[PDB]
Amino acid sequence: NWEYVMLDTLLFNKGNGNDEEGNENIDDPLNKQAQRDPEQEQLQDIAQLL
């Protein structure tokens, strides 16, 4: 129904602001090596937000 002219950074940069409850288990971190998306990184670089 509605479209947006401009491209912003808030939506994709507010995802990591969830570190609120952290007071607990420090379990093994090396298992959190998920694959960073090359397509997403290249899209972010090429379509640099105006």
Partner: protein
């Protein structure tokens, strides 16, 4: 000897360009974190002002 010098120059230039790319990407990502610490925190700070 010419091929050795040519490949030395090419690989040194590749090292230089990769170092400069790492430079640029590192500083750019550092500021990108800082800039994400401008807009998102701007909205969160408006929320905090309202609540206070």
């Amino acid at each position: 000897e010419q091929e050795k010098s040519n490949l030395n120059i090419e690989d040194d230039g590749k090292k230089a360009k990769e170092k400069e790319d790492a430079y640029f990407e590192d500083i750019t990502k550092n500021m990108k974190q800082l800039k994400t610490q401008l807009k998102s925190e701007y909205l969160e700070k408006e929320k905090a002002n309202i609540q206070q």
